[PDB]
Design a protein around this ligand. Structure first.
Ligand SMILES: [Mg+2]
Ligand SMILES: [Zn+2]
Lengths: 49, 118, 65, 181, 240, 148, 264, 121
């Protein structure tokens, strides 16, 4: 059981990265830009009504 | 409450009458005792703390001040030798302060002693 | 090496003996036989082996004592 | 016959075990602390519920009550001794603020992981169950061992362990013998 | 990634005064007020235009939290060309220079700082940028530097203080125009490490509301930072 | 510009890893009324329910609606104004409480919603990671709170 | 070594004390309880050895037969020492220990405090603060590189950077009323304990030694009435554990010797 | 006024030095000025400890400028020989850094001293 839950948790961690971005230690080395790119016309932010 | 204060005022009066018949009243230690009584008279945390429930210091000082003045006047009247400028020089700064006090009881006793020292 | 310690010693002249608790430290060894402990206790107490009795030995979890 | 002897259950099934919230909380907790099954989480939850119910009942009572003072002081003492409750928070109100995660932190497995003796929580469980870990002079083979503040500094490799200074295990000496042969 | 010999295509961002450098990767870049130098050793994009050689500076989100906001997609930014900005907590030319880049020559930036030692660098960097006004003062007492400050459309508070709400309100009341701008960075650890981050964030939103700030937006700054968010609001002098 | 709200960092999927004692709880107008009917104290019946300190919170909307109820509900207004009950300012025109409570919870994932209204509850239950509190039978009940 | 016995007690950096039998050439027992490195150990005719745990700031007496331990902690705070007076340096680590008696022992700390102990009392019975004095103040020409002398003096921060000498060595003659303390001050100090074993005073000093006193030993000869005592102290240019301390001017590597004759 | 400022009182230093020794045992300690600069540049430092008796003091005044700019608490200690003692290295140390780790076993002690340093600052 312990191994099964270990694989289940680490699998869950991978899916968490997809649903929302997560801190991953910050910047490592020279800043090489946004690897996945920038989206100009999209806002992730939640509005106060 | 006011009723209890009146009860206390009676009790303090009874102690004063006892002091009059007390041998210590004839000693000079009582003058020092009066002198002493004058100078003592003169968010984050709340976020954690459970709460389940839906200033008498000025009165205390006045009560002591009333007792000291009433004790001082009686001793000097009963014992003439204590009624001297040298003995009562130190109490003058208390008398002037007492004259300005809000309570009418203490100022009256302040007037009673001042008439004695006139 | 092996150490033998005796504690809580009570003199019992009613039974004409001495009672005590025996602790045996035996690093790097399984445990100590009763006859061997009787021999060493006899040596320590300066009495015959026949007059020494030992029992109730339980090795603690993890060994060595 | 011989007198009865008492026994008790150390855990209780949760009210609704099929709440998704409970399932995901348990997933996170087991993964973080390498717990074998949900019975461990239920045990810790039961203990915490008992403690917090006691603390609530104490907080009900008037302050300076003999019962409140005595048994609350005892509870704070036990909680600080286990290390769950910090020294600066010695009040029942912070007891009501306690959590399962802290008792899980005080488990021996988490501590062998944290101190650096093991590279992972599961590796720490293996090492503890395997008879490689000693608190002070005593070998502890139980991951659920709750360590105290003083006992925290005494966690090390056992003298008998191959990692602690004893001879190599069977695999190592077998391979060495085959290599020499 | 962006190795020194690579070329890049520059195109404008949705926000005025902000640009994107396309390529194998994407970089947020602002045009340099003072060309030929870097404030803090950042990579710089030189572009030839009819020919004059204009230069752009890269904006590092991990080092500038305002940049992390544009990365995360703030819907609206009050900082824009031709706007006066009051930068509180201006440790150095880290973000003030980039903020100064956005406002441009016509705009101005009022940089406020407390400790003297960074002020030396802020003054030196400020001399290269005529539009930046460094105010080496304690922000908890705006009346100390009421002298040097006019109205400002947007007040950007970078202060890492437990009482950050009070300083914002005092500065906003004195200098911020009606319908004016406020952009705040909140780090929950500094304010209250005892409670979780989100309980803290809700608390300052309430503290903003009592101070006649209507909050418009909030955004968390991950993956660039942990336990941080940027809240955007508007100042209703009359009432909420 | 297209806007799609971010998923709150407080939620591991639909598990809220942020809400934690002491709890912050939003009070609905019906919650106060029903509590008086069942003779359950607000602060304690919540403390008994969750075995933790509770920080009751009332917005301007719910306070306004309580005032509008009239003299018949004079008791509820007095309990709502107990000093332990902290107050939340509102910056939206409408005095409708149901939408205000829903908007607040959507944004900050720290609040439990204390209400018995069927319509309001359904909207809350759809929002992930939101514990929902109600008064039923003899005492308070909490639905989506894993730590219990 | 246990006095008049082959038993040996070894203090190791692994936070443990090991016991050996030299005649038998075997290890006997390992003792646990120290939270930090066990820097020093002392023993007398009894099996009751004492140790100090350095940064843990605890002195430990071990009863080998009983398998029990007594814990001693200084528990002094510069804060309280000042109001009762109305430079005091808090103890950082206990480095040396010597057993004056089976029922008494002394310790030396890195704040220059020599403390007397009794088994009955967990707290020190008597203390001698800054026994060896204060270290020389750092030179103003080296503290800073500014030209103006006054600027350099401000970096000295008055007397607040000053720190006391450490008690590198501390030895007491068994079952006597005198013990010797050592440091790199450049002198060995001789202390005499009171008859009631409640306090001690400075008997005198020997300034011959120059350098770090790593260890002190004393030997006696002559008739039981008339004895001559020879104090042998190891002197080094660096601390035994390592090379932290700055070089001491005039320090040399050698064996310091002092013969003290007894008359009265 | 002095360049070395703030410099801790006696009681605080032992609390600081106690944490340093624990951090050294747990591999959470970076020792020496050069490492401290790297940790500040990486944003991996809880706080910085420094020696006020460094000869000259000047060679470590670059760190506070870095520490403030990243809002990292910093503090001086009177003795460099004593600071090396706590670090576990055989030699004097003029500057040291505590690396950030929320999973460390000494998190409470590190945050305990860290709170005191800010009050000092
Ligand atoms: Mg084995
Ligand atoms: Zn509202």
């Amino acid at each position: 059981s312990r191994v099964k839950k270990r694989k289940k948790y680490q699998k869950a961690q991978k899916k968490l990265k997809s649903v929302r971005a997560v801190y991953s230690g910050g910047q490592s080395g020279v800043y090489e830009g946004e690897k996945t790119g920038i989206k100009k016309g999209l806002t992730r932010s939640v509005k106060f009504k | 409450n006011l009723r209890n204060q009146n009860k206390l005022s009676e009790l303090l009066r009874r102690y004063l009458l006892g002091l009059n018949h007390n041998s210590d009243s004839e000693s000079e230690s009582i003058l020092k005792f009066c002198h002493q009584l004058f100078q003592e008279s003169e968010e984050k945390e709340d976020f954690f703390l459970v709460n389940l429930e839906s200033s008498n210091s000025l009165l205390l000082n006045s009560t002591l001040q009333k007792f000291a003045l009433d004790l001082l006047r009686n001793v000097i009247t009963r014992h003439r030798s204590f009624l001297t400028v040298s003995h009562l020089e130190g109490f003058i700064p208390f008398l002037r302060d007492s004259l300005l006090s809000e309570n009418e009881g203490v100022v009256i006793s302040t007037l009673r002693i001042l008439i004695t020292l006139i | 090496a092996v150490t033998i310690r005796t504690r809580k010693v009570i003199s019992n002249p009613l039974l004409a003996r001495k009672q005590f608790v025996v602790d045996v430290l035996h690093p790097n060894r399984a445990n100590v036989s009763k006859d061997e402990l009787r021999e060493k206790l006899a040596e320590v107490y300066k009495a015959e082996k026949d007059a020494v009795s030992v029992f109730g030995f339980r090795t603690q979890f993890g060994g060595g004592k | 016959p011989r007198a009865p002897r008492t026994y008790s259950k150390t855990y209780s099934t949760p009210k609704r075990p099929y709440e998704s919230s409970r399932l995901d909380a348990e997933l996170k907790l087991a993964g973080e602390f390498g717990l074998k099954n949900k019975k461990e989480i239920y045990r810790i939850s039961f203990q915490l519920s008992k403690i917090r119910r006691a603390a609530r009942d104490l907080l009900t009572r008037d302050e300076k009550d003999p019962k409140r003072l005595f048994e609350g002081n005892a509870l704070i003492r036990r909680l600080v001794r286990v290390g769950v409750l910090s020294e600066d928070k010695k009040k029942l109100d912070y007891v009501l603020a306690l959590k399962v995660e802290d008792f899980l932190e005080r488990r021996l497995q988490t501590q062998v992981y944290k101190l650096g003796l093991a590279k992972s929580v599961h590796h720490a469980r293996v090492l503890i169950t395997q008879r490689h870990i000693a608190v002070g002079k005593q070998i502890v083979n139980i991951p659920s061992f709750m360590v105290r503040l003083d006992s925290e500094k005494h966690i090390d490799f056992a003298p008998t362990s191959p990692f602690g200074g004893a001879r190599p295990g069977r695999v190592a000496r077998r391979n060495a013998a085959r290599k020499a042969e | 990634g962006a190795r020194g010999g690579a070329k890049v295509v520059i195109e404008p961002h949705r926000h005025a005064g902000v640009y994107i450098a396309r390529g194998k990767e994407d970089l947020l870049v602002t045009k340099n007020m003072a060309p030929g130098e870097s404030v803090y050793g950042e990579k710089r994009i030189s572009v030839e235009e009819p020919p004059t050689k204009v230069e752009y500076r890269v904006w590092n989100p991990f080092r500038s939290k305002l940049a992390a906001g544009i990365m995360g997609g703030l819907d609206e930014l009050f900082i824009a060309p031709g706007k006066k900005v009051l930068y509180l907590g201006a440790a150095s030319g880290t973000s003030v220079s980039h903020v100064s880049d956005v406002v441009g020559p016509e705009g101005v930036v009022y940089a406020v700082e407390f400790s003297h030692r960074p002020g030396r660098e802020l003054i030196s960097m400020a001399k290269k940028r005529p539009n930046i006004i460094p105010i080496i003062e304690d922000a908890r007492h705006p009346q100390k530097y009421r002298m040097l400050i006019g109205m400002v459309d947007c007040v950007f508070a970078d202060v890492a203080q437990p009482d950050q709400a009070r300083i914002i309100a005092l500065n906003s009341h004195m200098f911020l125009k009606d319908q004016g701008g406020v952009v705040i960075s909140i780090k929950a650890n500094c304010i209250d490490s005892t409670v979780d981050a989100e309980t803290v964030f809700a608390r300052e939103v309430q503290k903003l509301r009592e101070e006649r700030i209507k909050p418009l937006e909030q955004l968390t700054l991950e993956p660039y930072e942990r336990d941080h968010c940027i809240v955007v609001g508007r100042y209703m002098r009359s009432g909420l | 510009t297209r806007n799609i709200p971010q998923v709150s960092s407080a939620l591991f999927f639909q598990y809220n890893q942020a809400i934690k004692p002491p709890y912050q709880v939003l009070i609905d107008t019906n919650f106060i009324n029903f509590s008086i009917q069942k003779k359950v104290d607000i602060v304690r019946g919540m403390m008994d329910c969750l075995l933790a300190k509770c920080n009751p919170l009332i917005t301007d909307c719910v306070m306004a609606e309580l005032e509008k109820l009239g003299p018949k509900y004079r008791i509820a207004l007095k309990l709502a104004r107990d000093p332990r009950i902290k107050r939340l300012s509102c910056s939206h025109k409408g005095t409708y409480a149901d939408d205000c409570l829903v908007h607040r919870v959507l944004q900050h994932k720290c609040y439990i919603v204390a209400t018995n209204d069927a319509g309001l509850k359904q909207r809350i239950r759809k929002i992930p990671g939101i514990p929902l509190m109600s008064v039923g039978g003899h005492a308070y009940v909490i639905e989506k709170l894993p730590d219990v | 070594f246990r006095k008049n016995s082959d038993q040996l007690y070894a203090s190791c950096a692994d936070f443990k004390i090991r016991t050996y039998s030299i005649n038998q050439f075997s290890q006997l027992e390992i003792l646990y309880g120290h939270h930090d490195i066990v820097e020093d150990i002392s023993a007398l005719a009894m099996e009751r050895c004492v140790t100090v745990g350095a940064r843990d700031r605890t002195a430990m007496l071990w009863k080998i037969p009983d398998e029990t331990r007594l814990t001693f902690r200084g528990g002094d705070e510069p804060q309280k020492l000042l109001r009762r007076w109305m430079l005091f340096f808090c103890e950082g680590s206990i480095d040396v220990v010597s057993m004056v008696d089976d029922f008494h022992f002394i310790t030396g700390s890195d704040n220059g405090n020599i403390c007397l102990w009794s088994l009955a009392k967990k707290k020190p019975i008597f203390t001698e603060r800054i026994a060896h004095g204060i270290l020389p103040e750092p030179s103003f020409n080296d503290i800073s590189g500014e030209t103006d002398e006054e600027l350099r003096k401000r970096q000295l921060q008055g007397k607040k950077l000053l720190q006391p000498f450490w008690i590198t060595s501390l030895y007491a003659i068994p079952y006597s009323n005198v013990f010797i303390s050592g440091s790199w001050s450049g002198s060995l100090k001789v202390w005499k304990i009171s008859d009631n074993l409640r306090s001690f005073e400075l008997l005198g000093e020997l300034s011959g030694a120059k350098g770090v006193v790593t260890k002190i030993q004393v030997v006696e000869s002559g008739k039981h009435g008339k004895e001559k005592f020879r104090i042998l102290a190891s002197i080094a240019k660096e601390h035994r554990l390592g090379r932290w301390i700055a070089n001491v001017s005039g320090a040399r590597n050698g064996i310091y010797s002092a013969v003290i004759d007894q008359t009265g | 006024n002095p360049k070395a400022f703030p410099l801790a009182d006696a009681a605080l230093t032992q609390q600081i030095l106690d944490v340093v020794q624990q951090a050294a045992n747990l591999r959470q300690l970076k020792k020496g000025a050069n490492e401290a600069t790297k940790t500040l540049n990486r944003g991996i430092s809880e706080f910085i400890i420094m020696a006020a008796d460094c000869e000259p003091i000047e060679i470590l005044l670059h760190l506070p400028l870095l520490c403030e700019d990243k809002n990292v608490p910093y503090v001086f200690v009177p003795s460099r020989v004593a600071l090396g003692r706590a670090c576990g290295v055989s030699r004097p140390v003029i500057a040291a850094s505590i690396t950030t780790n929320d999973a460390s076993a000494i998190k409470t002690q590190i945050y305990a001293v860290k709170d005191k340093i800010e009050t000092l600052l």
